[PDB]
Design a protein around this ligand. Sequence first.
Ligand SMILES: *CC(=O)N1N[C@@H](c2ccc(C)o2)C[C@@H]1c1ccco1
Ligand SMILES: *CC(=O)N1N[C@@H](c2ccc(C)o2)C[C@@H]1c1ccco1
Lengths: 244, 178
Amino acid sequence: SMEMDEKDFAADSWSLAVDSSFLQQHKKEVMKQQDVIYELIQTELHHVRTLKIMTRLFRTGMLEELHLEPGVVQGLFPCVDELSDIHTRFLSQLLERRRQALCPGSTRNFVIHRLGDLLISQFSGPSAEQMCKTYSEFCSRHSKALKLYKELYARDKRFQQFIRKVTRPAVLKRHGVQECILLVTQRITKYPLLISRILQHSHGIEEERQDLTTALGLVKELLSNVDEGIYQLEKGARLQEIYN
Amino acid sequence: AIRKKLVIVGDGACGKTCLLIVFSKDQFPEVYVPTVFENYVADIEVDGKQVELALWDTAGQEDYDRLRPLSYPDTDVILMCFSIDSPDSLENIPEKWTPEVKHFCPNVPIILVGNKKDLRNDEHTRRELAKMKQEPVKPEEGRDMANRIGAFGYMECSAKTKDGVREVFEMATRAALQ
Ligand SMILES: *CC(=O)N1N[C@@H](c2ccc(C)o2)C[C@@H]1c1ccco1
Ligand SMILES: *CC(=O)N1N[C@@H](c2ccc(C)o2)C[C@@H]1c1ccco1
């Protein structure tokens, strides 16, 4: 992550991020809505950062320092480039919406009144198709990635020393290889929980209540499609085991 | 320290996300209770042994039967959660959650946990349940269910007051070590 965005999302809530003289001018219902919108963006910022750890610390470090067999690194980090593009673009849009909403003379005081339209765009058309195909691929390769990691850690001493070295910093405590993989798989099922709670505090404007209800329906359709498109791959699985 | 993995399972209304947040945070969430839990690695010392306990939630995965099992690989301890203000969440334990956990996590200890124990003597809770011919889950109903499903043990807590929360995670660490 970049320092500018980390400081903007350092507080435990929107009500603690904004100045208290700005907070006091708003109704409690607006503060409740903004607190959940802030959590959505803060968790998306953390999710993009998990993907950057996977591509730039783990993936690139393995290609540059290790002598692994070709196609091994791809098995460990399936679809990470595609996933990083999808989520970095979505995050860019969420952060621009916040930036546009800032008061002149402030880098922290804002209210996002329109979010539903942005969530509909992300979870419909070509961008929904790309998230659906990418998560169907990633989640079907998840078990194989963990087993490949465990195989290399137990048999390759150099790989073992590499892992101990790059995961040693305290900021990486919950971001080892297997932890990053499960963090990515779990991301998509967080969206209906966050959107339903934003919707619960967005009844003031009927257009916004409608857009958030549409977005919620779109995310659930995507999750159901991803769930139905999963079939766990197994390294060295025989054809007979697959067609039975 | 040795690394152990904990996963919490249970219905959407069981309070599992709140339990993981209150244990992991440090300062109680008096301003905002987060909607979601990402992960956490707790540093725990139990009976003289130091353990790194990785914490995971299955909230959001309840309706997705093919995504949900991806949370199970290499789990060392399962917390099986139900809500004391929801006898329906207790009834879903033996024939929905227990067979799935025994299938994907064979020989992994399960601790059955009764969340929201503060609501056992709440007036609004008792009145709302009385309309549907129900009452808050009794301690003996929790123990008998834990005994019936082959649970390692039965524990109660309140994420709201923090009572019993530390004891649940210390016991889960001991269970993961056996
Ligand atoms: C993964 C993906 O992009 N798609 N899943 C589709 C679907 C419909 C029913 C099921 C089980 O899966 C729809 C969507 C798509 C759009 C265009 C081509 O595929
Ligand atoms: C899950 C749980 O035990 N709790 N959730 C609470 C809450 C407060 C506001 C909203 C939308 O939900 C109340 C209770 C709690 C409070 C602090 C710790 O747990």
